[PDB]
RNA sequence: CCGCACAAGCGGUGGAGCAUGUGGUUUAAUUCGAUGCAACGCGAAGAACCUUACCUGGUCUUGACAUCCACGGAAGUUUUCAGAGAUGAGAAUGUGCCUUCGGGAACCGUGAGACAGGUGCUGCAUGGCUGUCGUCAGCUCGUGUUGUGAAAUGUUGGGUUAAGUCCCGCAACGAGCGCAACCCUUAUCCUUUGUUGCCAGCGGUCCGGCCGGGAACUCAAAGGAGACUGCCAGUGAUAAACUGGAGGAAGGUGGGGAUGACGUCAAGUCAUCAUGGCCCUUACGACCAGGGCUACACACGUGCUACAAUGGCGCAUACAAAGAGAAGCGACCUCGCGAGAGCAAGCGGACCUCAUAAAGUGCGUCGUAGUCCGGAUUGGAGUCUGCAACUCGACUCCAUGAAGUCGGAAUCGCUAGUAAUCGUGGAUCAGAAUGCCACGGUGAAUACGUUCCCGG
């Protein structure tokens, strides 16, 4: 009975216009939405030799941080299923719909 | 008070003093003194020989001192007369399990030469 | 300016008798207690016929440089070229601040961004310690070229006074021509000003007198 | 000293990635090795239609790529039949629909790419390095830049020793990371090997971040 | 009725909700006392009321996560200064020039790289 | 040691060649690269030779060298001292 | 490194992929407890016959780009440079420099 | 400090008995920032200290760092042209610090089976103005005037 | 005038044992590079096979890899023999698809040479990358001025700053690269949203946040808000600045990062790659097996563990952060002394799991000893990974218990949440951490200062 929705981006911005759009949505048909919920980005370092062959003292560290809303309806309608199907996002986010 | 054994035990407490004998550790000496049910802190003194007796028992269930000693070195021995690897290495007192003879060796190795 | 208007403010006023230069003994009365007396009876025309040029220069448009770096008269000279319309340098002359022209109207340009920009929005989108740090740029190009921002080219008259004092400014303006009026105590060289007024440098009320004298002709060659 | 490179440092803040695509530890190997190929290829193909940037985003069901380049015309021949093909090679790359598309930049002179292919090819011609970074640099300030610099490094002139130099023009801050460097390096092939240049533009500070 | 103050330390976070009554004070649901094996942190969490002396006069029901015991204590002493102000405010001046109402933020520093820790250096040989 | 659950371990044609030799009688030192082979009971009073990785040296095999491997008996590598 | 390392490597890993199951249900009877002990025997027989190559350990991560096993970074499966080179120009999606 | 002196850190008294000079004296023993089992130590002195030595502890403590605390230092310099042993004199806050210093060394000095026997009975010797530490002070004191 | 430069501090190194590198030595081979600072737990974030370039041997010659040409076969699947395998030798089955039927595509096999191939040489032919001075405070420019000019000024003086930081002086003025700031993160608050997170007040509850229920808080993460010498006083040109005070979660660039100007060093790397030039080509290319890269009279760095009663040991018991996870993490349960095994839930993960932190604390215990210290070494027996643990894995069990009792000359590290200690995680990785990169627990001492040391 819950449509549950997590996203999943690299950058919160975008992310964040997706879970708006969701929402949005979602108050198209009407739905009962519980918001954009932020749950905890996930960290990625990476050190690494950029100095090539024998230097060792030179390093970096890169990261990589996966941001994470998740959002819910407990009330689907048809326009909330058909619709919520009929969107579209940008490339940078990934969709994760159970229900 | 005689373990049946050469060495003596020390007025220690019981698992310490049987771990002294050769070929008995610290889990032998106390399996034998659980197997005796014997209190731990008593020492070598304080216990009559109606103890030392079962002690003396249970520990010739074991195999100590010298009859041990010979065992290792017969293994040991025959080892080397097997011209297996290990046996070489023994005969030329180096570390057998695989260790750096480039340096710090010298547990086995000894003292230090030019 | 009539000689008894000068005499009261103490016109006739100099340095000591100690220090003084070899030009100036034309323009000297005479000395009294150690003390250099300027001669008010060249004084006084000189100051006409330099009025004169001065009404005619401004009833041409002329653009006009009030040039006085004294602490204390700094206020009195910029307030002299407020009442006329005109463009001042209240503080310290800087080297080439006209014969380096380029180099002050880039720095007109940076004190014209800074407020147009203050004026349109950004400070916002800046830190507000950087934004603060903005206004102190502002004030600073302020208390430096407050003057000379709308002087728009280089000015057609100096005024300046104690020529000894500000004697690059005169160097910079022979060398481009400009003509320089200028009041000329005892202790300077009066080579430099092609309009020289021979008078007291110094004391408050005198140096009012010039800048109030002079802006009035001034406006009067603005009126026609 | 050792610079830093000054794209990587202002991505996020000021630049933004070349590659949009989301993916799971999963299939993040392959799909970047993907796109990197893609990237290779269509360089090869456009190798003389002055390509500048190549940003591929995947959609879960679809490949996307555009490219900014000046001569549009060039890529898309007559009714984008250059162009399809190359959507055919770059599906089955891919091994996806692909989608392409074409954004052309419009001041060549103001990018980094194009500029820096351009000085490699007329120092192939062996064109005066020195005058051809001029003309470069001076194209570009004239353009509006706020400020460039190039620099070329390498047996230059064909000569028998790695005198590199350096030349710079106008304004370009290198620590403020409220500005915008396009930044892009090339390679040229002499015949006495190969030659090194490096392309900064500073076109001003961003204000109201990403944005 | 019910204050609440919010303490932090290095690495633990208080929830302290205070009610007028007593001086008995639990934490987690355990007593301070035997809650805490050493003396000085019971010390250093009964500072601010052994300073304002209003000891048994309002009774704790305190909560904390996180860090060592350290962490705790200091979170604790934290978050009842905070609930002591927002219930008196008369005591502000009082706990401040305590050092109470400092919110100490000395935290850990990061492991840099080339560094054994995050400022120790290895013993290189100049010789 | 491996496990016991699999039990030992040798190479099939070393079982192949050395149950050759037993049911055709004695046979040469025959020649093995497989180091990493079990000694097996059966091969007992033979001998067998092993690349020592540049040669393979003859090893005459007898009942207590089962168990261990066939590598033990080939010193890949010479010394003498310095 | 030579293209006969990346192609070595290359047909390691077409290799012991086809023998995947048989690996696996290999492996499986010889684990398995109350087998034969008989049928486990000739089972890791059978299992040696097979190519050396069959075994995972044999396969060693290389980069895809320049053929270097050393320095792997298995999320990207380069190698330890590369890596640098599609970060700063930013065609790894939201990589960047860490500084926390 | 080459441009700008600065020192340790102010610290906080030990609650236990109100003195941060018993603070800053367990900071001196604590090893590996381990507190508890350091304060331990000198509290099980103290409290032996207030019986064996009359009562007030917390005062045992200065009648034997008073019997400690030097008076005279040496501070070797070459602002003369080479190293100087010259005697000079120390704020308070110096001294005591040495003093601390000399009696909690004294006290790794013995064994005895135990700490508390060790720092304890070391106190009460220094309390009597007899022993090692005040006894290094004296000769920190004979050097330095030879 | 600066700098953990010294001083003042603490804790080491140098002594032992071991780990690890390097050199020497040996080797059939111990592949290559890296060489004072600024090479020596360095390339390598992980050599049993593999890797691997080394040796020994067995082999192949348009070739392992690529295009092109032919010519023939679907592709494959299944299997046998010989070999150590490469490999040959076979034996079966399949012989599939587009085709406008001519063919193609698809692969594979033979030939054909063009050719492919090289971890071959030259980092003094190069690119690219990096170290180093050094996050050192500098670097210069337009213009102006002075000079016939080479130039100089700015940029110097007084100050002051972490700083070419800033004021003042100043024929200079300005700019630009630097510095600073914009970025990340941490310290306060508010706003928004509250599940898998949370529980103040709520009713039930087996009393477990568990759960109808609460949205406050803790958190979570997006947004904001905040610190500016802003305020006070005192100093100093009154200036800059400085000292103190207030207030404040924070105070004087709050903390930590990232960020490296010119240029230096034919620095380093032609074995990541790219590349000039040269050199090999039935071989300096290619394949397989085994061996080596792990060798020991040695020497040297780097580290680890220790020499003990602030201790060791038994029992009991509390508090973390940061992570990672699907040919994966793997619970629970059962078996096993244990390493583990079996069984098998759960989880692509605020949920499941790795996983119960250790020091701490409580009690007992040990009595100063080569010890209930220390644990190397050797025996024995197991386990697990993996074709495969002999050379040469990790680990468990039993037994064995060296040297070591604080280490000369000398030397190193650090100004606080640091040092020093205590554990946790990750990378690489089938497996293989005292190394590396992280996270937390606890948590010091000293700084009169600039005489010297050393560098600037
Ligand atoms: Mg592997
Ligand atoms: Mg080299
Ligand atoms: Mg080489
Ligand atoms: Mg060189
Ligand atoms: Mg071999
Ligand atoms: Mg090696
Ligand atoms: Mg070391
Ligand atoms: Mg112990
Ligand atoms: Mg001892
Ligand atoms: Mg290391
Ligand atoms: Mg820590
Ligand atoms: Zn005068």
């Known amino acids: ?47 690494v030799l950029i100095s090539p062959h024998v230097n060792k003292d030179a390093r970096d560290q890169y990261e990589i941080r996966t941001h994470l809303r998740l959002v819910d309806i407990v009330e689907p309608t048809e326009k909330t299923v058909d619709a919520l199907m009929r969107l579209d996002l940008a490339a940078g986010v990934d969709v994760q719909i159970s229900l | 008070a005689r373990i049946a054994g050469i060495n003596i035990p020390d007025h220690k407490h019981a698992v310490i003093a049987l771990t002294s004998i050769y070929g008995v550790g610290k889990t032998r000496s106390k399996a034998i003194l659980a197997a005796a ?10 216990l009559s020989e109606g103890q030392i007796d079962t002690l003396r028992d249970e520990v010739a269930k074991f195999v100590v001192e010298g009859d041990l000693r010979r065992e290792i070195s017969m293994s040991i021995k025959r080892l080397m007369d097997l011209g297996c690897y290990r046996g070489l290495r023994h005969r030329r007192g180096l570390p057998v399990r695989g260790q750096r003879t480039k340096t710090n060796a010298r547990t086995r190795k000894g003292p230090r030469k030019p | 300016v009539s000689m008894r208007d000068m005499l009261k403010a103490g016109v006739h006023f100099g340095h000591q008798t100690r220090y003084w230069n070899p030009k100036m003994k034309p323009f000297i ?29 401004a009833s041409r448009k002329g653009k006009i440089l009030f040039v006085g770096t004294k602490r204390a008269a700094s206020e009195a000279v910029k307030d002299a070229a407020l009442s006329c319309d005109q463009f001042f340098v209240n503080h310290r002359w800087l080297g080439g601040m006209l014969t380096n022209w380029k180099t002050v109207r880039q720095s007109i340009k940076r004190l014209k961004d800074l407020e147009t920009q203050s004026q349109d929005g950004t400070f916002d989108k800046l830190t507000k310690k950087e934004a603060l740090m903005r206004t102190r740029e502002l004030e600073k190009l302020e208390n430096s070229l407050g003057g000379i921002k709308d002087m728009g080219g280089l000015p057609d008259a100096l005024f300046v006074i104690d020529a000894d004092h500000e004697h690059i400014a005169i160097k910079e303006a022979n060398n481009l021509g400009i003509p320089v009026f200028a009041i000329v105590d005892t202790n300077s060289d009066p080579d430099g000003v092609d309009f020289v007024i021979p008078g007291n440098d110094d004391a408050i009320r005198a140096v009012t007198l010039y800048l109030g004298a002079v802006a009035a002709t001034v406006r009067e060659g603005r009126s026609q | 000293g050792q610079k830093v490179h000054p794209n990587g440092i202002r991505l996020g803040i000021v630049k933004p990635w070349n590659s949009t695509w989301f993916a799971n530890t999963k299939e993040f190997a392959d799909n970047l090795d993907s ?174 971040g990403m944005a | 009725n019910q204050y609440y103050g919010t303490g932090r330390r290095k690495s633990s976070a208080a929830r302290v909700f205070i009610k007028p009554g007593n001086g008995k ?71 401040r020039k305590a050092g109470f109402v400092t919110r100490d933020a000395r935290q850990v520093e990061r492991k840099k790289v080339g560094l054994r820790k995050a400022r120790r250096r290895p013993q290189f040989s100049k010789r | 040691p491996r496990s016991l659950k699999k039990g030992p371990f040798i190479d099939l044609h070393l079982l192949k060649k050395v149950e050759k030799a037993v049911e055709s009688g004695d046979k040469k030192p025959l020649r093995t690269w497989s180091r990493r082979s079990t000694i097996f009971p059966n091969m007992i009073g033979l001998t067998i030779a092993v690349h020592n990785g540049r040669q393979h040296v003859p090893v005459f095999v007898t009942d207590e060298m089962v168990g261990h491997k066939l590598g033990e008996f080939a010193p890949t590598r010479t010394y003498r001292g310095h | 490194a030579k293209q006969s ?67 792997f970074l298995r999320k990207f499966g380069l190698s330890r440079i590369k890596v640098r080179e599609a970060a700063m120009r930013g065609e790894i999606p939201g990589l960047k420099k860490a500084s926390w | 400090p080459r441009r700008r002196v600065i020192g340790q850190r102010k610290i906080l008294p030990d609650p236990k008995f109100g003195s941060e000079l018993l603070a800053k004296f367990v900071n001196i023993l604590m090893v ?97 103005n007899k022993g090692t530490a005040v006894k290094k002070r004296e000769d920190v004191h004979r050097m330095a005037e030879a």
């Open chain 1, 1 to 47: 009975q819950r449509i549950r929705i997590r996203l999943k981006a690299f950058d919160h911005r975008l992310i964040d216009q997706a879970t708006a759009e969701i929402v949005e949505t979602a108050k198209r048909t009407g739905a009962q939405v519980r918001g954009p919920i932020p749950l905890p980005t996930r960290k990625e370092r990476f050190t």
């Open chain 2, 37 to 46: 049910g014997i209190a731990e802190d008593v020492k070598i003194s304080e």
């Open chain 3, 29 to 57: 009365f005479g000395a009294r207690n150690k003390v250099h007396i300027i001669n008010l009876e060249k004084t006084v025309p000189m100051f006409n016929e330099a009025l004169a040029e001065l009404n005619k220069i």
């Open chain 4, 35 to 208: 796109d990197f190929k893609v990237r290779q290829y269509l360089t090869k193909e456009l190798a003389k239609a002055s390509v500048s940037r190549i940003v591929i985003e995947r959609p879960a069901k679809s490949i996307r790529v555009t490219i900014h380049t000046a001569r549009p015309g060039i890529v898309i021949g007559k009714k984008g039949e250059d162009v399809e093909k190359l959507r055919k090679v770059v599906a089955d790359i891919a091994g996806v629909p692909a989608q392409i598309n074409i954004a052309e930049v419009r001041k060549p002179e103001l990018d980094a790419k194009l500029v820096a292919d351009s000085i490699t090819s007329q120092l192939e011609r062996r064109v005066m390095f020195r005058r051809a970074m001029k003309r470069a640099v001076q194209n570009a300030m004239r353009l509006g830049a706020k400020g460039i610099k190039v620099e070329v490094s390498g047996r230059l002139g064909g000569a028998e020793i790695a005198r590199t130099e350096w030349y710079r023009e106008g304004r370009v801050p290198l620590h403020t990371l409220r500005a915008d460097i396009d930044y892009n390096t090339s390679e040229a092939h002499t015949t006495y090997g190969v030659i090194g240049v490096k392309v900064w533009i500073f076109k001003g500070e961003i204000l109201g």
């Open chain 5, 25 to 95: 004070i639990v934490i987690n649901q355990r007593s301070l006392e035997q809650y805490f094996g050493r003396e000085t942190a019971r010390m250093v969490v009964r500072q601010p009321l052994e300073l304002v002396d209003m000891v048994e006069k309002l009774d704790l029901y305190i909560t904390v996560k996180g860090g060592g015991i350290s962490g705790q204590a200091g979170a604790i002493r934290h978050g009842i200064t905070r609930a002591l102000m927002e219930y008196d405010e008369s005591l502000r001046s009082e706990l």
């Open chain 7, 5 to 71: 390392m990346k192609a070595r490597e290359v047909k390691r890993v077409a290799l012991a992929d086809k023998y995947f199951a048989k690996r696996a249900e290999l492996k499986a009877i010889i684990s398995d407890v109350n087998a034969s002990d008989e049928d486990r025997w000739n089972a890791v027989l059978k299992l040696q016959t097979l190519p050396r190559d069959s075994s995972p350990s044999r396969q060693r991560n290389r980069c895809r780009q320049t053929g270097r096993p050393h320095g």
């Open chain 8, 32 to 128: 590996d920032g381990k507190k508890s089992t350091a304060e331990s130590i000198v509290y099980s002195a103290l409290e032996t200290l207030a019986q064996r030595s009359g009562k007030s502890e917390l005062e045992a403590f200065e009648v034997a760092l008073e019997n400690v605390r030097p008076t005279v230092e040496v501070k070797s310099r070459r602002v003369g042209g080479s190293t100087y042993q010259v005697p000079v004199e120390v704020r308070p806050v110096r001294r005591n610090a040495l003093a601390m210093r000399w009696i909690v060394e004294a006290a790794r000095k013995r064994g005895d089976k135990s700490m508390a026997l060790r720092l304890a009975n070391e106190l009460s010797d220094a309390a009597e």
